[PDB]
Structure formats: structure tokens, C-alpha cells
């Protein structure tokens, strides 16, 4: 049923929470598809998850710019390097190999949710003080 679950450990601004939650939803959609061995749907879901992640990263970057966040550069580059990883995964998924599926799911879970979404909390106080929600 579920591979990962958003939790209080990840709480951030309410707009950021909605996008982080929707990313969690995409990961679990991808897991359900890969589990059923429906690889066409799994690739479709992965495509949507990539595009959503890019747009979520871009939402954060716009907030960084708008609010003159001091660590905009570092954070944007961390995003950029992860997109590069996703694009590589996307290519590797073309051949539908169980091993590649797992690399992807574990990378999304281990790095995006369990690491990067926690790291996102670092901009929270700064943006909240300036009235962002
Ligand atoms: Ca093969």
C-alpha cells in the first residue's frame, strides 16, 4: 500500500507542506505501479513526479529570490544536482529493470523525503518572519 509517509518531522510552511505531501503521494503512486509490475504506468508516474519536483523546487527558489534568502545559491544547486539524478533515473527506467526501480524508490525515499525535506526546514523561520505561508 504505502512506501513512505509524510509526518510532523517534516512540517514547514503550509504551502510547502502541500507540495511535500503531494511528492510523497507521487512516490507511493510509483511504488504501487512498480509493485503491480505495470511499467508503462510506473514510467508515466515517474515523469509526473519529476515534473512536479522541478516545479516544487522552482516554487522554493522563487520564494528565495522574492525574499532575498541568504542561502538561495546553495539550496538551488542542491535542487539542480538532484534533478540531474532524477533525469538519470528516468533514462534507466526505460528498460523497466526491477533493480533500477528499487534504486529509484530508495533514492527518492532516502534522499528526498528523509534528507532534503528535513533540510528544507532551514529556510522556514526566515521566510515565516517575513510573512510567507
Ligand atoms: Ca533487463
Author numbering: 4 to 136
What does the paper say about this structure?
As a target protein for engineering the coordination sphere, we have selected DcrH-Hr,8 which contains the histidine-rich coordination sphere and exhibits spectroscopic properties characteristic of all Hrs, but contains a larger substrate-accessible tunnel within the four-helix bundle compared to classical Hrs. As for classical Hrs, the diiron site of DcrH-Hr reversibly binds O2 but shows more rapid autoxidation.
The diferric form (met-I119H) exhibited two absorption maxima at 325 and 375 nm, which are well-established to arise from oxo to ferric LMCT transitions in the oxo–dicarboxylate-bridged met-Hrs.1b,c,8 Resonance Raman (rR) spectra of I119H gave a characteristic peak at 499 cm–1 for the symmetric stretching Fe–Ooxo–Fe vibrational mode. The coordination geometry of other His residues and carboxylate ligands is almost identical to that of met-WT (ESI†). In the latter case, the H119 residue is capable of forming a hydrogen bonding interaction with an exogenous ligand.
